[PDB]
Paper text:
Type II AFP is a 14 kDa globular protein composed of both α-helices and β-strands with five disulfide-bonds. The Ca2+-dependent type II AFPs have been identified from Japanese smelt (Hypomesus nipponensis) (jsAFP), rainbow smelt (Osmerus mordax) (smeltAFP), and Atlantic herring (Clupea harengus) (hAFP). In the present study, we determined the crystal structure of a Ca2+-dependent type II AFP from Japanese smelt denoted jsAFP, and made a structural comparison between its Ca2+-bound and -free forms to elucidate its ice-binding mechanism via Ca2+ ion. The obtained data revealed that binding of Ca2+ does not affect overall structural motif of jsAFP but alters its side-chain conformation as well as its rigidity of the Ca2+-binding loop, facilitating a formation of the polypentagonal ice-like waters on the IBS.
The X-ray structure of jsAFP in the Ca2+-bound state was determined with preparation of its crystal in a solution composed of 0.1 M sodium acetate buffer (pH 7.0), 0.2–0.25 M ammonium sulfate, 8% PEG 3350, and 2 mM CaCl2. The overall structure of the Ca2+-bound jsAFP is composed of two alpha-helices (α1 and α2), eight beta-strands (β1–β8) and four loop regions (L1: C69–W75, L2: W77–T81, L3: C89–Q92, L4: D94–E99). The molecule is further stabilized by five disulfide-bonds (C4–C15, C32–C125, C69–C100, C89–C111 and C101–C117) and a hydrophobic core composed of aromatic and aliphatic residues. A Ca2+ ion was located at the molecular surface between β7 and a loop segment L3–L4 of jsAFP, and was coordinated with the side-chain oxygen atoms of Q92, D94 E99, D113, D114, a backbone oxygen atom of D114, and an oxygen atom of a water molecule. Significantly, a total of 16 waters are organized into an ice-like arrangement on the putative IBS (left). They construct at least five pentagonal rings (PI~PV) and one hexagonal ring (HI) that are next to each other, in which a few oxygen atoms of the side-chain groups of jsAFP are also involved. The side-chain OH-groups of T96 and T98 are therefore thought to play a crucial role to anchor the water molecules via hydrogen-bonds, and function as a scaffold for the polypentagonal formation. The obtained docked model showed that waters 1, 3, 4, 5, 6, 10 (cyan) as well as the side-chain oxygen atoms of D94 and E99 perfectly match to the waters constructing the 1st prism plane, whose RMSD was less than 1.0 Å. The B-factors along the sequence of the Ca2+-bound jsAFP (cyan line) is lower than that of the Ca2+-free form (orange line), suggesting that 1 mol of Ca2+-binding rigidifies the overall structure of jsAFP. Indeed, the IBS of most the AFPs tends to be hydrophobic. It is speculated that the Ca2+ ion in the jsAFP structure plays a role to neutralize the electric charge of the acidic residues of the IBS, which increases its hydrophobicity to lead and organize the polypentagonal ice-like waters.
Residue numbers in the entry: 3 to 128
The structure:
């Protein structure tokens, strides 16, 4: 039920893009194949997504941030910010590091990151 290479979890198709890109390049790459950088809304979705990110659980971009107004988090896929997994000392909430990166540090958790940093990414389409 997903296109070749994409992986199904509860009605949504996901793809890991290993190419290291800034957040906007990563979003554009998802969009070229009809997708967005992913959102996360449950523990099971989160585990499924982590399992796409190589054995290394590579630090990766998600489709979230607070880049318009600090502390106001939004996803790119029309869903709301509900579930989060902030690392200790996150989020900073500063506009200079406003894009959400997952798989950060030993704890494999979220950190609001300068959007120009280069990371792999997770795309999703439903
Ligand atoms: Ca941060």
């Amino acid at each position: 039920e997903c296109p070749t290479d994409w992986k199904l979890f509860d009605g949504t198709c996901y793809l890991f893009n290993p190419s290291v890109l800034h957040w906007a390049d990563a979003q554009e790459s998802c969009m070229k194949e009809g997708a967005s950088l992913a959102s996360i809304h449950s523990l099971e979705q989160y585990t499924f997504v982590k399992e796409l990110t190589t054995a290394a659980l590579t630090p990766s971009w998600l489709g979230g941030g607070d880049c318009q107004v600090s502390t106001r988090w939004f996803w790119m896929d029309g869903t709301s910010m509900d579930f989060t997994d902030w690392c200790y000392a996150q989020p900073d909430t500063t506009l200079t590091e406003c894009c959400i990166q997952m798989n950060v540090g030993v704890g494999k958790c979220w950190d609001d990151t300068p959007c120009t940093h280069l990371h792999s990414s997770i795309c999703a389409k439903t």
